[PDB]
């Protein structure tokens, strides 16, 4: 149906819009890409939906999908102007990517990162917003951290619950900026020999959507 977009995202701890009324351009909105940089990195690699290859002559929003039962809307506001995911699949060498199976309700992907302010190894998570929140004890405010607490849980909860909370509708999308010097050059984590933290980390925020116009 029609175009779609994100509309609502939770990044400020308080929703406060996040779509530029009158018409969609960057009229007066700053780039400032800190939270956005992460919310475009995770959002890229940690995706399964694609635009069935690229495009012959025709719009991103009327390609098709290929993908699995999560969403494609997660990607419809990435490949538009945020970056080639079909490229970043190979840009990042893809260290390890623990499956969720049916207990975990989260996935991980470690990955390297050659470029930008990101450490040479990082980690990214996706999965059910609550089941992430279990470990997730920070949140990311305009490139800064904040400590999560019962109050920041509340802010998350009432947001998440406004957005859906039904099933697969809201996802979590978090990361971890791992150390360079204090981690191994051999990227030797494995899935057996983990050695990586799975704790407070950095929640980043909710890449939720809308569906009615
Ligand atoms: N690619 C994905 N990456 C991460 N999480 C995803 C992805 N696609 C869907 N999810 C997750 O699917 C997971 C499984 O929970 P879900 O409620 O879907 O189980 P189910 O097996 O369908 O349950 P039921 O047996 O009741 O139908 C949830 O963690 C949800 O976040």
């Amino acid at each position: 149906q029609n175009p779609m977009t994100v509309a609502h995202m939770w990044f400020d701890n308080q929703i406060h819009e996040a779509d530029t009324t009158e018409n969609q351009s960057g009229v007066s909105f700053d780039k400032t890409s800190a939270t956005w940089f992460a919310l475009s990195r995770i959002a890229g690699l940690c995706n399964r939906a694609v635009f069935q290859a690229n495009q012959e002559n025709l719009p991103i929003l009327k390609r098709a999908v290929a993908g699995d039962a999560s969403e494609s809307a997660l990607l419809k506001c990435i490949e538009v102007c945020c970056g080639s995911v079909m490229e970043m699949r190979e840009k990042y060498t893809k260290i390890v990517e623990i499956p969720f199976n049916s207990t975990n309700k989260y996935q991980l992907s470690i990955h390297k990162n050659p470029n930008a302010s990101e450490p040479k190894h990082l980690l990214v998570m996706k999965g059910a917003p609550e089941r992430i929140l279990d470990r997730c004890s920070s949140i990311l405010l305009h490139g800064k951290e904040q400590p999560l607490d019962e109050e920041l849980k509340d802010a998350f909860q009432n947001a998440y619950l406004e957005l859906g909370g039904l099933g697969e509708r809201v996802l979590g999308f978090c990361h971890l900026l791992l150390p360079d010097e204090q981690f191994p050059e051999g990227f030797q984590f494995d899935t057996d020999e983990v050695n990586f933290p799975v704790d407070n980390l950095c929640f980043v925020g909710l890449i939720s959507m809308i569906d009615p116009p």
Side-chain angles (χ1 to χ4, degrees), residues 54-74:
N54 292 122
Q55 42 141 243
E56 236 76 294
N57 222 318
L58 78 313
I60 183 171
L61 69 130
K62 318 178 104 158
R63 276 295 309 128
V65 174
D68 212 353
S70 63
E71 245 281 40
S72 157
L74 290 166

Side-chain angles (χ1 to χ4, degrees), residues 17 24 38 56 88:
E17 54 179 30
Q24 51 86 48
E56 236 76 294
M88 86 198 311

Side-chain angles (χ1 to χ4, degrees), residues 25 82 109 119 165 194:
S25 284
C82 312
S109 224
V194 158

Side-chain angles (χ1 to χ4, degrees), residues 48 69-70 100 102 104-107 126-129 168 171:
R48 314 215 143 175
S70 63
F100 79 71
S102 39
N104 293 323
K105 316 269 293 221
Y106 88 94
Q107 275 204 271
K126 211 214 303 167
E168 261 290 85
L171 262 155

Side-chain angles (χ1 to χ4, degrees), residues 41-193:
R41 284 176 195 124
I42 310 153
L45 286 163
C46 278
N47 208 316
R48 314 215 143 175
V50 277
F51 280 120
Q52 293 254 67
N54 292 122
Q55 42 141 243
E56 236 76 294
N57 222 318
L58 78 313
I60 183 171
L61 69 130
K62 318 178 104 158
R63 276 295 309 128
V65 174
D68 212 353
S70 63
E71 245 281 40
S72 157
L74 290 166
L75 128 104
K76 284 197 184 172
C77 220
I78 294 294
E79 215 253 287
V80 65
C81 255
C82 312
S84 177
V85 182
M86 289 230 65
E87 169 143 36
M88 86 198 311
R89 77 182 186 71
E90 62 167 305
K91 195 220 294 206
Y92 297 88
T93 297
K94 188 166 83 290
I95 309 172
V96 276
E97 58 171 322
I98 293 174
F100 79 71
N101 287 274
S102 39
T103 177
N104 293 323
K105 316 269 293 221
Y106 88 94
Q107 275 204 271
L108 150 161
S109 224
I110 293 183
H111 300 248
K112 300 185 81 178
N113 198 337
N115 187 234
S117 325
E118 223 69 323
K120 288 151 176 184
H121 305 123
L122 91 170
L123 184 167
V124 293
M125 293 196 185
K126 211 214 303 167
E130 357 41 76
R131 279 80 192 185
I132 299 199
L133 185 85
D134 228 345
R135 49 178 101 282
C136 248
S137 241
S138 324
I139 202 283
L140 197 77
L141 267 276
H142 306 256
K144 308 164 172 174
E145 281 144 19
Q146 281 217 108
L148 219 79
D149 273 294
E150 54 216 30
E151 285 286 84
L152 295 253
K153 256 80 171 208
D154 186 271
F156 152 86
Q157 208 70 219
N158 276 301
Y160 156 67
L161 290 171
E162 196 80 84
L163 300 162
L166 310 179
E168 261 290 85
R169 198 158 202 82
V170 185
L171 262 155
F173 289 82
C174 39
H175 76 174
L176 165 54
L177 304 185
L178 287 171
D180 171 18
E181 277 166 313
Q182 320 305 322
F183 261 40
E185 296 193 281
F187 50 76
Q188 188 155 37
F189 307 105
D190 205 272
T191 58
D192 285 334
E193 289 279 358

